[PDB]
């Protein structure tokens, strides 16, 4: 399990995380992938967390896309990615509450 | 077997590198060998060696040497100040794509005073600069809203060199002290407010 | 001015005897860049070197008494104490060690110098030594408790010789900044900063009977009473080499060794150079090498001992030169 | 099993603990001090086998620079110091190789000084090498790297 | 005038050059003793302080009003000197008085070249190629001996 | 050369004469 | 590169650490003296 | 460099960079003068003055630094301060010709 | 606390099978582990030119690549891998495949071997 990722997703760590989730309510919304279809999330806190995560992602995307080699295609691709992120964020701002 | 472009490249490398560093040079010339490269250099490339012919007296001397140091030919060469093979000869007497590619490579090498750390550092700096400009752009965009510029995060209690004034050394209170200096300073600062505005 | 020159002309110096080579003891396998003698007796003198060793030498015979191997890097300086039977030595390994002489074995490595330490001076009266290195700082040590007691910040570059006087001007430093300082250990500060040199004053020595301190930059040997911290004289050192050593004899016979190896002697206080001596070296050694790096007299004063870069130590036995100022 | 009589063993352990008391008080205590107030400016120590040579070299360089400074007047000397150092290095390399280090622009005195210091270095180096060889011959805790160096250095010397 | 005051002529002048019989006296024995005592007391005190500081074992007035200072015995477990935490501290030099730095008074020779190594190029900065005949009697004599000998053998 | 010449003696000293253990100063105090 | 030579060392005084160094431990409290 | 805040950010960064370069080669004296110049340009006379002083402290025996500082002082028509500085320089170093001449 | 640590501490209630099951349940949700292009450190055997900026990355030069499994194996039961790299100067994704028929590699729309 060299290079840290393996360590992170080693069974023991996972178990610990699960335990934390069970007792006290420590989740790491960084750690899990954000769900595709909203309205399968009855809790508000979770939703908020997800929204926050997406915002963070968007910010990250923004930070990188103004790099100096602007003509490279990665940046262009991200522009679409950025849009997608924005859309997701908007969706997360649903009007149930 | 040695081609002329390759030879030229080798010579260039030697001026770039060093006549006692025959690995890099070898690498530069994909087909020729490290220990061979040095030999080649010794033979043809180095200017101080007099590869050209010489007068009759010299020839005579060489022949005498040959007689009196039975074919101890390197020694003879040394004595002469001449190269060996040439001396011996005298005594006896009495594809394109590859070139293009290698040249390109070689040129890139010799010119670029770079590697991992040199290339990385500048690139990193550039990236940082880009980031900074992006930030500025963002703030410009959101100017109607009140926005503050993000500070460089501290690592272990450092100074932000805007405020505080850094480790100040005195003006040193002298004898002909006059109070206009302060006024002048104030005046100077007045202008910068205007600039800011 | 004419008022001073005339006066100088009028005054005469005393006829100090010349100096001739006596002993040469090629024994070290390295520069011999320190030398010292016993205050109490004048039987032996030790000489630290680029060997890393330091060797002890009987004067009379010239024979090597014994070696001492308590450093790693090269010895830069030593100091046998009058008041105790300790030999302090110091090397560019950053170690200021202390040899008992009842057992010829190190005791108290003093620790604190950040880098190569250049000189020691034991305080004539206290049980305290003083050391200074390229650190740019002269630390004083309590020898009992083997700790730096105080330290002397003033200097702005590496500090070479750092003599100890018994009065108030208790330390007489000498840097590459070309200041030579007078300090007050008790105050934790300087008292007077003699800036009169042009270059690195890489040599200085206390006069035995006269409470003054010759000091030498690249050429001009200044010499000064440190009571006030006031100049006493300027020596005729006009085109002599880079002054390495600057020992003073009991009988006012200041010696100066150069990077040239030209052993130059002077009458003290006069400022009158009264001899030059051409160096010598071994048949194998080169003519550039020969250079008196370290030197000192005996307590009597009839034998000058010069450690020269020939891996040698030369001891020197004994019509004066005409004056002619500027 | 079932032999009691733990006394002497117990005594032994107690006595062992005595020694530790001190060591632990320095050690554990030190650690806790660090945790509360964690050291300012430590000083490394060249009496270590490692770092010795480098340190020595540095010292030599410094000495040479000082000598050169003493020698003659300069304006903006910092720049020149580097050059001097480079020259010294080159000289050393030449010596190692057994190339004569003759540079035409080098003025007699400076050059002479450089030569002297390289001679000194050689003296220090050759002797050291010899010592190492002797140690190796004996069987006296030689470092693998050190031994390799000796082999190389000695070979070079032989060639010379 | 101020400048003059700051740096005076007698600094440059050596004092012995005029008067030779003038000698600086070796300091008075009593005085020396006193000095030793002062420094000895001070250094000893300093050492004591240092010892106290080391973590290993083994009255006043303000204004007109009088005030008793005490030192309370802190608990031996808690850090002795709870103030200190190994802080970096830059100090100002604070040299208000000006040091007088006094002094006195072929350039092409003393200039030194910029050498280029045959072994090293830190920057990789290329450069336009900056990188006895008599032999002893033996070498002829020996040859003569040899060839002649050979000839003799042949004949 | 000149260190060798005339009356002035050069001493080659490899070996230390007096032993290594023996003291360079002694401190005897009452029999 | 940063593999670099040097110009000068240092000596700056901070607050002492109060650490129990091994060598600093007491030893040879008795200083010897000469006879006179 | 549109806004004040932007300028500050830039300036700050520059200062930091200068500091970094100093911390290594404190005894350089080219860097110090550059820093001083930068400060002058920025029209923070205090800062520039401080920098020059610091440089002087590092290397008092360096005439160029002194002269540049003097020039800076004079440049801002701040003669009295400049005069004082000159006097100080003179006091420090009499046997240098140049200060007196200046 | 030390790389050769024999036994990692477990809580007093740690049904190992149960724990494993739990992990599995929270592996589909997991971000890392449920993805492709897992990282790797590799030297470059091909010694090739980056097709965008012509940067001549030579043999044995070290990179932090991404190894990903190619679903279409060679023959039957011997896998082949895509090994992503970036050129030093320009950030173009070079990669290569390991077709073991020739005991060597294949370039994959990154650069060209020479």
From Swiss-Prot, chain A:
UniProt-annotated location(s): Cytoplasm; Nucleus
Function: Involved in pre-mRNA splicing and cell cycle control. As a component of the NTC complex (or PRP19-associated complex), associates to the spliceosome to mediate conformational rearrangement or to stabilize the structure of the spliceosome after U4 snRNA dissociation, which leads to spliceosome maturation. The cell cycle arrest of SYF2 defective cells may be due to the inefficient splicing of TUB1. Also involved in DNA repair.
Family from the record: Belongs to the ISY1 family.
Note: Present with 1990 molecules/cell in log phase SD medium.
Oligomeric and partner information: Belongs to the NTC complex (or PRP19-associated complex), composed of at least CEF1, CLF1, ISY1, NTC20, SNT309, SYF1, SYF2, and PRP19.
The protein, known as: Pre-mRNA-splicing factor ISY1
Source organism of this protein record: Saccharomyces cerevisiae (strain ATCC 204508 / S288c) (Baker's yeast)
Entire-sequence positions represented here: 1 to 97 of 235
Swiss-Prot record, chain B:
Subcellular location: Cytoplasm; Nucleus
Domain HTH myb-type: start-end pairs: 1-49, 52-94
Regions that span the bilayer: none
DNA-binding region, residue intervals: 22-45, 73-94
Function summary: Involved in pre-mRNA splicing and cell cycle control. Required for the binding of the NTC complex (or PRP19-associated complex) components to the spliceosome to mediate conformational rearrangement or to stabilize the structure of the spliceosome after U4 snRNA dissociation, which leads to spliceosome maturation. Its absence leads to an arrest of the cell cycle, possibly due to the inefficient splicing of TUB1.
Family: Belongs to the CEF1 family.
Other noteworthy facts: Present with 784 molecules/cell in log phase SD medium.
Subunit structure comment from the entry: Belongs to the NTC complex (or PRP19-associated complex), composed of at least CEF1, CLF1, ISY1, NTC20, SNT309, SYF1, SYF2, and PRP19.
Protein name: Pre-mRNA-splicing factor CEF1
Residues of the full protein shown: 12 to 246 of 590
UniProtKB/Swiss-Prot annotation, chain C:
Superkingdom in the source lineage: Eukaryota
Tagged with keyword Aminoacyl-tRNA synthetase: no
Cystine bridges: none
Statement: the UniProt record of this protein carries the keyword DNA damage: no
Keyword terms: Cytoplasm, mRNA processing, mRNA splicing, Nucleus, Repeat, Spliceosome, WD repeat
Residues that span the membrane, as ranges: none
Residue ranges of WD repeats: 27-58, 70-100, 112-142, 154-184, 196-225, 238-267, 287-317
Gene Ontology CC, one term: cytoplasm
Annotated compartments: Cytoplasm; Nucleus
Chief place of localization: cytoplasm
GO terms for biological process, alphabetical: mRNA splicing, via spliceosome
Subunit structure: Belongs to the CWC complex (or CEF1-associated complex), a spliceosome subcomplex composed of the U2, U5 and U6 snRNAs and at least BUD13, BUD31, BRR2, CDC40, CEF1, CLF1, CUS1, CWC2, CWC15, CWC21, CWC22, CWC23, CWC24, CWC25, CWC27, ECM2, HSH155, IST3, ISY1, LEA1, MSL1, NTC20, PRP8, PRP9, PRP11, PRP19, PRP21, PRP22, PRP45, PRP46, SLU7, SMB1, SMD1, SMD2, SMD3, SMX2, SMX3, SNT309, SNU114, SPP2, SYF1, SYF2, RSE1 and YJU2. Interacts with CEF1, CLF1, NTC20, PRP45 and SYF1.
Function, in words: Involved in pre-mRNA splicing. May also be required for cell cycle progression at G2/M.
Family to which the UniProt record says this protein belongs: Belongs to the WD repeat PRL1/PRL2 family.
Miscellaneous comment as given in the Swiss-Prot or TrEMBL entry: Present with 1770 molecules/cell in log phase SD medium.
UniProt name for this protein: Pre-mRNA-splicing factor PRP46
Source organism per UniProt: Saccharomyces cerevisiae (strain ATCC 204508 / S288c)
Gene: PRP46
Residues of the full protein shown: 111 to 445 of 451
From Swiss-Prot, chain H:
Subcellular location: Nucleus
Superkingdom, natural source: Eukaryota
Ranges of the HAT repeats in the UniProt entry: 9-41, 43-75, 77-102
Function: Involved in pre-mRNA splicing and cell cycle progression. Required for the spliceosome assembly by promoting the functional integration of the U4/U6.U5 tri-snRNP particle into the U1-, U2-dependent pre-spliceosome. Also recruits PRP19 to the spliceosome, as a component of the NTC complex (or PRP19-associated complex). The association of the NTC complex to the spliceosome mediates conformational rearrangement or stabilizes the structure of the spliceosome after U4 snRNA dissociation, which leads to spliceosome maturation.
Miscellaneous comment as given in the Swiss-Prot or TrEMBL entry: Present with 2140 molecules/cell in log phase SD medium.
Subunit organization: Belongs to the NTC complex (or PRP19-associated complex), composed of at least CEF1, CLF1, ISY1, NTC20, SNT309, SYF1, SYF2, and PRP19.
Family: Belongs to the crooked-neck family.
Name assigned to this protein: Pre-mRNA-splicing factor CLF1
Organism listed in the record: Saccharomyces cerevisiae (strain ATCC 204508 / S288c) (Baker's yeast)
Organism ancestry: Eukaryota, Fungi, Dikarya, Ascomycota, Saccharomycotina
């Amino acid at each position: 399990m060299s290079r840290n990722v393996d360590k992170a997703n080693s069974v023991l760590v996972r178990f610990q995380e699960q335990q934390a989730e069970s007792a006290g309510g420590y989740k790491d919304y960084s750690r899990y992938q954000r769900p595709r279809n909203v309205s399968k999330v009855k809790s508000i806190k979770e939703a908020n967390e997800w929204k926050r995560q997406v915002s963070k992602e968007i910010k990250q995307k923004s930070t990188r896309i103004y790099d100096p080699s602007l003509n490279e295609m990665q940046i262009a691709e991200l522009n679409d990615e950025l849009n997608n992120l924005f859309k997701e964020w908007k969706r997360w701002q649903w009007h149930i509450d | 077997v040695w081609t002329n472009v390759e030879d030229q490249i080798l010579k260039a490398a030697v001026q770039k590198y060093g006549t006692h560093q025959w690995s890099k040079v070898a690498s530069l010339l994909q087909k020729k060998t490290a220990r061979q490269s040095e030999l080649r250099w010794n033979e043809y490339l180095n200017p101080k060696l007099n590869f050209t012919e010489f007068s009759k007296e010299e020839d005579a001397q060489l022949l005498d040497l040959a007689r009196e140091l039975p074919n101890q030919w390197r020694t003879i060469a040394d004595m002469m100040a001449r190269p060996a093979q040439v001396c011996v000869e005298r005594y006896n007497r009495l594809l394109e794509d590859e070139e293009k590619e290698m040249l390109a490579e070689a040129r890139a090498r010799l010119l670029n005073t770079q590697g991992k750390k040199a290339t990385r550092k500048i690139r990193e700096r550039m990236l940082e600069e880009s980031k900074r400009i992006a930030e500025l752009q963002k703030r410009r965009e959101l100017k109607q809203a009140g926005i503050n510029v993000a500070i460089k995060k501290p690592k272990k209690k450092y100074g932000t060199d805007i405020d505080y004034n850094e480790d100040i050394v005195y003006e040193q209170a002298p004898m002909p002290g006059i109070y206009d200096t302060s006024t002048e300073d104030r005046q100077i600062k007045k202008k910068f407010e205007q600039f800011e505005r | 001015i004419v008022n001073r020159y005339e006066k100088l002309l009028s005054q005469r110096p005393e006829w100090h005897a010349p100096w001739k080579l006596s002993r040469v003891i090629n024994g070290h396998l390295g520069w011999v860049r320190c030398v010292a003698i016993d205050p109490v007796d004048n039987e032996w003198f030790i000489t630290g070197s680029n060997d890393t060793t330091m060797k002890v030498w009987d004067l009379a015979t010239g024979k090597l008494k014994t070696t001492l191997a308590g450093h790693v890097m090269t010895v830069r300086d030593v100091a046998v104490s009058d008041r105790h039977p300790y030999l302090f030595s110091v090397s560019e390994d950053k170690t200021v060690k202390c040899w008992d002489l009842e057992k010829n074995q190190i005791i108290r490595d003093y620790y604190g110098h950040l880098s190569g330490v250049r000189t020691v001076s034991i305080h004539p009266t206290l049980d305290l030594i003083a050391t200074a290195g390229r650190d740019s700082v002269i630390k004083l040590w309590d020898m009992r408790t083997r700790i730096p007691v105080i330290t002397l910040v003033g200097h702005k570059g590496p500090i070479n010789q750092v003599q100890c006087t018994p009065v108030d001007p208790q330390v007489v430093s000498s840097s590459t900044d070309a200041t030579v300082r007078l300090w007050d250990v008790v105050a934790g500060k300087t008292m007077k900063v003699l800036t009169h040199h042009k270059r690195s004053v890489r040599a200085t020595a206390l006069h035995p009977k006269e409470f003054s301190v010759a000091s030498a930059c690249t050429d001009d040997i200044r010499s000064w009473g440190l009571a006030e911290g006031s100049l006493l004289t300027n020596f005729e050192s006009e085109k002599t080499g880079i002054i390495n050593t600057l020992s003073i004899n009991q009988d006012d016979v200041l010696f100066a060794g150069g990077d040239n190896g030209v052993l130059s002697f002077y009458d003290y206080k006069s400022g009158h150079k009264y001899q030059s001596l051409a160096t010598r070296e071994m048949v194998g050694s080169l003519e550039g090498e020969r250079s008196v790096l370290c030197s000192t007299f005996d307590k009597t004063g009839l034998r000058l001992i010069t450690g020269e870069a020939d891996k040698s130590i030369k001891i020197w036995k004994q019509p004066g030169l005409a004056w002619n100022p500027n | 099993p079932g032999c009691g009589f733990w006394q002497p063993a117990w005594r032994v352990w107690l006595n062992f603990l005595r020694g530790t008391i001190p060591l632990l008080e320095r050690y554990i205590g030190n650690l806790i001090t660090r945790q509360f107030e964690g050291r300012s400016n430590e000083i490394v120590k060249t009496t270590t086998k490692q770092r010795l040579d480098a340190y020595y070299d540095l010292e030599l360089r410094n000495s040479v620079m000082d000598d050169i400074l003493e020698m003659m007047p300069e304006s903006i000397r910092q720049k020149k110091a580097r050059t001097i150092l480079q020259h010294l290095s080159e000289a050393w390399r030449c010596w190692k190789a057994n190339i004569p280090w003759d540079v035409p622009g080098m003025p007699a005195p400076i050059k002479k000084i450089i030569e002297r210091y390289i001679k000194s270095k050689a003296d220090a180096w050759v002797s050291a090498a010899h010592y190492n060889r002797e140690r190796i011959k004996r069987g006296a805790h030689v470092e693998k790297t050190m031994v390799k160096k000796n082999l190389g250095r000695l070979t070079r010397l032989w060639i010379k | 005038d101020q400048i003059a005051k700051n740096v005076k002529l007698d600094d440059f002048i050596p004092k012995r050059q005029s008067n030779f019989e003038l000698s600086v006296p070796l300091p008075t024995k009593a005085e020396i003793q006193e000095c030793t005592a002062r420094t000895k007391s001070y250094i000893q005190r300093l050492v004591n302080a240092k010892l106290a500081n080391s973590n290993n074992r083994a009255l006043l007035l303000n204004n007109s009003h009088h005030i008793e200072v005490v030192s309370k015995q802190m608990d031996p477990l808690l850090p002795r000197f709870v103030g200190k935490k190994a802080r970096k501290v830059v100090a100002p030099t604070e040299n208000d008085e000006v040091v007088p730095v006094l002094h006195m008074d072929d350039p092409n020779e003393w200039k030194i070249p910029a050498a280029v190594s045959n072994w090293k190029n830190p920057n990789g900065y290329t450069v336009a190629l900056e990188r006895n005949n008599t032999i002893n009697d033996g070498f002829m004599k020996l040859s003569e001996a040899l060839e002649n000998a050979d000839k003799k053998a042949r004949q | 050369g000149k260190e060798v010449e005339v009356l002035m003696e050069t001493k080659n000293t490899q070996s230390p004469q007096t032993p290594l253990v023996e003291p360079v100063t002694e401190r005897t105090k009452l029999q | 590169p940063q593999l670099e030579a040097r110009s000068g060392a240092k000596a700056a005084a901070y607050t002492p650490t109060g650490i129990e160094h091994a060598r600093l431990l007491p030893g040879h409290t008795t200083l010897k003296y000469r006879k006179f | 460099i549109l806004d004040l805040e932007e300028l500050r950010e830039y300036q700050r960064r520059k200062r930091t960079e200068y500091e970094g370069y100093l911390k290594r080669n404190r005894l350089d004296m080219g860097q110090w003068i550059r820093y001083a110049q930068f400060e002058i340009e920025q029209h923070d006379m205090r800062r520039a003055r401080s920098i020059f002083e610091r440089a002087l402290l590092v290397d008092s025996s360096f005439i160029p630094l002194w002269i540049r500082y003097i020039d800076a002082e004079l440049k801002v028509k701040c003669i009295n301060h400049a005069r004082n500085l000159m006097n100080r320089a003179i006091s420090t170093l009499p046997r240098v010709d140049k200060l007196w001449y200046k | 606390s030390e790389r050769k640590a024999i036994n990692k501490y477990y809580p007093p209630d740690y049904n190992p099978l149960e724990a494993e099951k739990l992990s599995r349940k929270m592996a589909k949700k997991l971000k890392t582990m449920n993805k492709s292009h897992a990282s790797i450190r590799l030297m470059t055997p091909f010694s090739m030119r980056c097709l965008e900026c012509n940067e001549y990355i030579p043999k044995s030069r070290k990179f932090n690549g991404k190894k990903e499994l190619l679903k279409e194996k060679y023959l039957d039961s011997i896998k082949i891998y895509r090994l992503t790299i970036s050129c030093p100067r320009c950030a173009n994704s070079i990669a290569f495949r390991t077709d073991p028929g020739n005991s060597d590699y294949v370039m994959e729309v990154g650069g060209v071997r020479n």
